[PDB]
């Protein structure tokens, strides 16, 4: 039933293997709100088709206060509802498939701080933001939340998002990090609640959890700096109702102050290592963020058009040979005018062509995979 599903390692479509190679714009809904920016949606989707990019990351969130979705516990501002309903309608009217994140780790607005501090407000006497993870009202904020999100019918297409198969997968939270409890237990229980309950509401969708991809104890040496962060790459995976697995990674903001030798070292090894845990798991392995700031020393785009072929090369040498990677996602595009949103990450395409070759060159060589 057009829907996105998995085969073993691979994501797949109509009974055929499905390689990503997309973006993200976690803003798209934002701009789509105000009917003077809404073009910049169609724009970008428009040249996300013509380079031939298949999947937009983005968030089912806002993540400022002005401009709200949820303004309060169950309180929803339709005009940014309609925003979002756009932002699907128009994925769909030129061939992009969305993934969708449902809160924010990070930031005051968007995020589990804000859901903390709404629990707050209504007379819980919570201290610390990974109360997220274990408060009974928020958790009830959280999964009334992903219900709305989930059953809404869309203003323009009439589905319900969750019928929709413009979605390729639901993303239960964007970097989570539960620093309170390194045992990761806090989080692990979480992340066993609310796929368990997601899956209840839409089992026709894909689900992810939305990890960076730290490892627990044992393996933490491959994390940045052998940190851990109160996730577990493998015991969170394997959660049922997780159909597949992702990383992010940002060598220069995890790794400042190393050499570029010693980031190259740990960037290859943090994909190869997540690939052999990916297949373990005999789930997809995702590339959900990577990127090349321009606020790098010296920068000219050449270092960000090699960086972005060495990431297209590891997933297609993996892809080709039968291996877990199912595609990559890089951080991020704007639109054109969008000069206030910069945060050295930014791929305007219309304005990239070097850039925008790379990424269309890496869709043409998975097209020829099965």
Known sequence: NNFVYTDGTHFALNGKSLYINGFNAY????????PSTRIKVTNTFQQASKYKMNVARTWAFSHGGSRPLQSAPGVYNEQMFQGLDFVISEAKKYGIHLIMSLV???????????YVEWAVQRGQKLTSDDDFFTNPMVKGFYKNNVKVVLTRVNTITKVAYKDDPTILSWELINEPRCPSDLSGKTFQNWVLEMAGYLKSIDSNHLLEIGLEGFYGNDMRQYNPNSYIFGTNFISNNQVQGIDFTTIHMYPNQWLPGL?????????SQWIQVHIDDSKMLKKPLLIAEFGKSTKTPGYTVAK??????KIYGTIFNCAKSGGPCGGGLFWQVLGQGMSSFDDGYQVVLQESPSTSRVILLQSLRLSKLS
């Open 304 to 309: 960000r058009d090699n960086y972005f072929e």
């Open 104 to 114: 924010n780790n990070w930031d005051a607005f968007g995020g589990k701080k804000q």
């Open 27 to 34: 803003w798209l809904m934002y701009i789509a709100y105000d």
């Open 259 to 267: 050499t570029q030798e010693a980031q190259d070292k740990w960037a």
